[PDB]
């Protein structure tokens, strides 16, 4: 009840990087989302603060083509839209 419950499309995201649970602290979520971005190589060599998720499950979930890591509010909005209420 400290924790938060992923909607199952994001929870399938988390397991494609080795996650075992189905509830999580925010930290776990942020950390797994980062696995993803760095494993699936979703970024520009030119400007590395932009993540491009255009043709990818991540983009699906967040409903965007791309977004900047410097933009937290906007990130948490995207994450929460995927949290079981
Ligand atoms: C991938 C991740 C481990 C990490 C960053 C990261 O390392 N990235 C960004 C893509 C290219 C690569 C890079 O070389 N940079 C240092 C800019 S830069 C960076 N900052 C972190 C810690 C972060 C965490 C929470 C928020 Cl709300 C925003 C940013 C965190 C993060 C976590 C979740 C998401 Cl969805 C996006 C970014 N993040």
CATH of residue 51: 1.10.245.10
Query: CA–CA distance from 59 to each of 2, 62, 70, 84 (Å)?
Result: 27, 5, 17, 19
First vs last C-alpha separation in the chain = 12
The resolution, in Å, is 2.8
Which domain covers residue 53, as residue numbers?
A: 1-85
> Which technique was used to obtain these atomic coordinates?
X-ray
Atom of ligand 1 nearest to the CA of 72: 27
Contact between residue 4 and residue 23 where contact means Cβ atoms under 8 Å apart: yes
The finding on whether 70 has its CB within 6 A of some atom of ligand 1 is no
Atom of ligand 1 nearest to the CA of 49: 17
Looking at the 3D structure of the chain, how many domains does it have? 1
Q: Ligand 1 centroid vs 34 CA: distance in angstroms?
A: 6
What CA–CA distance (Å, rounded) separates 5 from 24?
7
DSSP label at 3? S
């Amino acid at each position: 009840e400290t924790l938060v419950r992923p909607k199952p499309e994001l929870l399938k995201l988390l397991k494609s990087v080795g996650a075992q649970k189905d509830t999580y602290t925010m930290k776990e979520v942020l950390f797994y989302l980062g696995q993803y971005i760095m494993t699936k190589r979703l970024y520009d060599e030119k400007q590395q603060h932009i993540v491009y998720c255009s043709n990818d499950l991540l983009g699906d979930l967040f409903g965007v083509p791309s977004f900047s890591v410097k933009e937290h509010r906007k990130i948490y909005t995207m994450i929460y839209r995927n949290l079981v209420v």
